[PDB]
Design an enzyme around this catalytic site. Structure first.
Site, short mmCIF file in Angstrom:
data_model
loop_
_atom_site.label_atom_id
_atom_site.label_comp_id
_atom_site.label_asym_id
_atom_site.label_seq_id
_atom_site.Cartn_x
_atom_site.Cartn_y
_atom_site.Cartn_z
N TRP A 1 0.80 -1.21 0.00
CA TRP A 1 0.00 0.00 0.00
C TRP A 1 0.84 1.27 0.00
CZ3 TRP A 1 1.71 2.42 4.10
CH2 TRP A 1 2.10 1.67 5.22
N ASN A 2 2.16 1.18 0.24
CA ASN A 2 2.97 2.40 0.41
C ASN A 2 2.92 3.29 -0.82
OD1 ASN A 2 3.91 0.18 1.96
ND2 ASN A 2 5.97 0.35 1.07
N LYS B 1 -1.61 -8.00 -8.25
CA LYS B 1 -2.22 -8.07 -6.93
C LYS B 1 -1.84 -6.92 -6.00
CE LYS B 1 -3.12 -9.51 -2.66
NZ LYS B 1 -4.15 -10.53 -2.98
N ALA C 1 -2.37 -4.33 -2.53
CA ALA C 1 -2.68 -4.48 -1.12
C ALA C 1 -4.19 -4.24 -0.91
CB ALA C 1 -1.86 -3.50 -0.31
N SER C 2 -4.82 -4.99 -0.01
CA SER C 2 -6.24 -4.78 0.24
C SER C 2 -6.55 -3.43 0.90
CB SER C 2 -6.83 -5.91 1.08
OG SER C 2 -6.70 -7.14 0.41
N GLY D 1 7.15 -5.51 -0.63
CA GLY D 1 6.36 -5.60 0.59
C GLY D 1 7.16 -5.91 1.84
N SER D 2 6.58 -6.64 2.77
CA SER D 2 7.28 -6.93 4.02
C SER D 2 8.38 -7.99 3.85
CB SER D 2 6.29 -7.32 5.13
OG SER D 2 5.65 -8.55 4.87
N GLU E 1 11.79 -6.41 -3.46
CA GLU E 1 12.10 -5.14 -2.85
C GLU E 1 11.41 -5.14 -1.49
OE1 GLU E 1 11.21 -0.63 -3.53
OE2 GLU E 1 11.88 -1.52 -5.47
N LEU E 2 12.19 -5.37 -0.44
CA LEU E 2 11.60 -5.59 0.86
C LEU E 2 11.91 -4.44 1.84
CD1 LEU E 2 12.84 -9.31 0.98
CD2 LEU E 2 10.59 -8.56 0.15
N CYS F 1 10.18 2.90 2.52
CA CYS F 1 11.45 2.24 2.83
C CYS F 1 12.61 3.08 2.36
CB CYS F 1 11.51 0.84 2.24
SG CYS F 1 10.39 -0.26 3.10
N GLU G 1 12.44 -0.59 11.50
CA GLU G 1 12.01 0.55 10.71
C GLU G 1 10.65 1.02 11.21
OE1 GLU G 1 11.59 0.48 6.43
OE2 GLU G 1 10.62 -1.49 6.44
N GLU H 1 15.04 -2.38 -9.91
CA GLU H 1 14.01 -1.79 -10.75
C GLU H 1 14.52 -0.44 -11.21
OE1 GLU H 1 10.64 -1.78 -8.05
OE2 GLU H 1 9.89 -3.68 -8.91
#
Lengths: 476, 481
Positions: free
Chosen positions: B155-156, B179, B181-182, B232-233, B254-255, B288, B386, B463
């Site tokens: 979602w960021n 897909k 984030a909800s 994501g996480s 990319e975490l 991040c 973080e 990326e």
């Protein structure tokens, strides 16, 4: 017992020092040709491997990196060390591997080639400044050493394999901890003996040997080893991905293959037979690049098989040190048995025997069988032996699907005189390497790596040079 | 409930069609500013996700590829589509994320530049013949589509993230299953609504939404999804690695990160202060790329805090739909509680409150005020974890070598920043910093023109820039005799 000026130090190598802490602990190295032990090699402990990593970490230099010209010179000197010792290094390879002496020497030449390519192209890792100046900065991209890396290699190419990894690791300025297969450590030891006299920085290259569990564990868990380059079994490789997931380590993987070798009814049959034999019996078939499934068009199947039989029947099997031996023994009993099993399975399921002996009558001779289908073991799994299983096909679309009918996607080969068809088959095959009217394997000048379960990353060529770097972007 | 022309289809997108099999199954989206539900999105089942893949597979053209000019036109059209619908996507983004409308719109701009950059540089993926001819052959290297990819985003950056992945995947000819984030599906829906009117091939893009378990499981297990691109996480990322090991799937990851923002005593303080405030508070610090540890040299610490508290106090928090709001709410209670807990932890262990409120004074909302603490060391949570919030923790240091080890004192290696009038020193810092991204006297984040990604446990792959263009392709060597 083997004796060689390259093996007066039968032990590990850590921070410029031949040493080990096995306390006399040992593992045997056999000659598959004689069934006899030719050397007892120190089986090193956890702590040696950790010592190796500390040494590598201590040769790693970020703030004051070894210069491009200094690294290029290591690369050239190694190329030159291999070439100079091809005969003796090749001798040790023949004896622990099985591979004929001449072929073994050639592998050393092949290895030299990778150091040569990295020496001439090491400038490709030069940092660069993009021309665009977004958010009012100047953007420079650097390629940093990834860090100390573990280079793990199998017995398939006791010298060619590490050459692909070490050359690119040195080019990037990465120290390495090197682990050979317990089947063929001697070629490694010899190789270090040559490097030992080339003024590499202490801890730039290190050699550990012994139980795979002990070595693998340290290398997976160690925080100073940000990267593993592994070549070997898909089983072992999958366990690596799992065991390095928490640190999210960077992996280069080259694993199993199921190379389809495809011959069309408009193929140059003589070239194809000639290419097939050269391809197939390199290393007694014990390669991931060796053809495993031979697809032949129904219209030429019979004539092709006869062409291979004429060729295969003139070949000799035996001790590879002797002269005039085309193929040596398989590496071990387990490998021999799997090849015998595949042979039996095909025949029992009704393939015909074109050339070779019946399994009961069986060193494994070059063997050709015809009438193979997806139901045979040799179609489903890789033989790793001097077996040629021929399967039939008629259409282009069918043979591409059959080609891709596997978990893997390392090597493949297509023979046809229709250039437009050949090109489509290459695009359609989910393999990293496709021979077009050739059966030749990877070269240092170009990328080699698998799609699908055959691996991650590319060795050789431009992209190979980037394996052991991390891009770092710096806006000013 | 939210109403928009870009959201006339509140459902998935498979094979050209807006559809789903949720059978009424819904999940709620909230506006973080009001606590109200603004939409009810279909919770798509397994079979929908499998359909998504079948569609994509059906768009995959290995043997008769989509010509490079065709793909070029898609990117160009998408880049133009974003820019055109930049204010209404910005609206939907604002309401579901919390980010201020302005910032939101700018994110749409940012997203557009990836597509632009990929259109300009798509030629990079052209096959090429090497000059050497070993073994009597002519050697050609091709870059084939990896196949159908799963693009998974957090979602960021409801529009920025996906833009990085999809621009590269189209340039490659890779059909994708997408897909979001909800917490932020609506920006995604809006994006698909915009692309739906661009004459893309049926199956090139596909949208799935709902329960993470469900979607995630199909994408890991399916044999026609050779590659996953996940932001994501770090936790979920680790799980993906494990769950795709059997097929040895190609992954781009990319975490998490723990960015050190470093300020030397010879640094231009006003510029660093300016930079710090722009870097840290974007997305309300929920990024991040946001500074997480601010290392300041003892000789300039006091003056530096002053400068930072001076700028922070002028800032304003509120609903992001309203003009003049510099920062909006945080995304959810879990995120809010964490920012709170790091604030508490810092003060419990001695840190000084230079600017902002004591945790017990914090409002009943998800609104968290820009805050500045001084006196922070490695013993403190916000230093170890973080923070993902508008918190600015200040740690002191003296030497170059000390602050470089300090910066590397983390699992990760995503972003980092160094300010210093000394250019030879600045270069040794970038070199020693194990981070994929190092700002040199700037705090700006990644750009389409350059590679971005993590060393260490911050991920795998890059990326943006050239290397980003090569993420979604498999190199294939074809020697010819």
């Amino acid at each position: 017992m083997i004796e060689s000026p390259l093996l007066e130090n039968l032990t590990g190598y850590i921070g410029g020092r031949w040493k080990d802490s096995a306390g006399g602990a040992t593992f045997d190295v056999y000659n598959p040709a004689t069934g006899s032990v030719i050397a007892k090699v120190p089986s090193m402990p956890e702590e040696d491997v950790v010592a190796a990593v500390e040494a590598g970490q201590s040769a790693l230099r970020l703030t004051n990196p070894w210069p491009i010209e200094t690294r290029r010179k290591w690369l050239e000197d190694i190329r030159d060390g291999l070439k100079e010792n091809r005969e003796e290094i090749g001798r040790i390879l023949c004896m622990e591997h099985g591979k004929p002496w001449k072929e073994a020497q050639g592998e050393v030449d092949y290895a030299a080639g990778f150091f040569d390519y990295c020496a001439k192209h090491i400038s490709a890792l030069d940092s660069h400044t993009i021309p665009e100046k977004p958010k009012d900065c100047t953007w420079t991209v650097h390629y940093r050493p990834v860090g100390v890396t573990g280079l793990i290699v199998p017995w398939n190419f006791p010298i060619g394999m590490i050459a692909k990894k070490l050359s690119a690791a040195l080019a990037a300025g990465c120290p390495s901890v090197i682990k050979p297969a317990s089947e063929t450590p001697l070629t490694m030891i010899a190789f270090f003996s040559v490097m030992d006299k080339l003024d590499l920085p202490d801890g730039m290259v290190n050699l550990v040997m012994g139980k795979a569990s002990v070595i693998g564990k340290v290398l997976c868990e160690h925080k100073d080893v940000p990267m593993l380059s592994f070549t070997g079994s898909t089983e072992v490789g999958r366990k690596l991905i799992v065991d390095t997931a928490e640190q999210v380590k960077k992996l280069a993987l080259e694993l199993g293959g199921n190379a389809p070798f495809i011959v069309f009814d408009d193929a140059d049959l003589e070239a194809a037979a000639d290419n097939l034999i050269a391809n197939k019996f390199r290393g007694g078939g014990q390669t991931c690049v060796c053809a495993n499934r031979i697809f032949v068009h129904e219209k030429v199947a019979d004539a092709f098989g006869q062409k291979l039989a004429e060729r295969v029947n003139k070949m000799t099997v035996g001790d590879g040190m002797n002269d005039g031996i085309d193929i040596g023994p398989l590496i071990n009993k387990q490998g021999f048995d799997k090849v015998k099993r595949h042979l039996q399975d095909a025949l029992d399921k009704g393939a015909s025997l074109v050339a070779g002996k019946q399994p009961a009558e069986l060193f494994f001779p070059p063997t050709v069988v015809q009438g193979v289908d997806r139901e045979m073991c040799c179609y489903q799994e890789e033989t790793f032996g001097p077996l040629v299983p021929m399967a039939l096909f008629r259409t282009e679309e069918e043979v591409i699907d059959a080609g891709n009918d596997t978990e893997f996607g390392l090597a493949s080969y297509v023979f046809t005189a229709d250039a437009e068809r050949a090109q489509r088959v290459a695009a359609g095959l989910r393999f990293g390497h496709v021979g077009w009217n050739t059966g030749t394997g990877p070269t240092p000048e170009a990328p080699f790596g698998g799609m699908k379960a055959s691996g991650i990353g590319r060795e050789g060529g431009l992209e190979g040079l980037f394996e052991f770097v991390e891009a770092q972007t710096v806006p000013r």
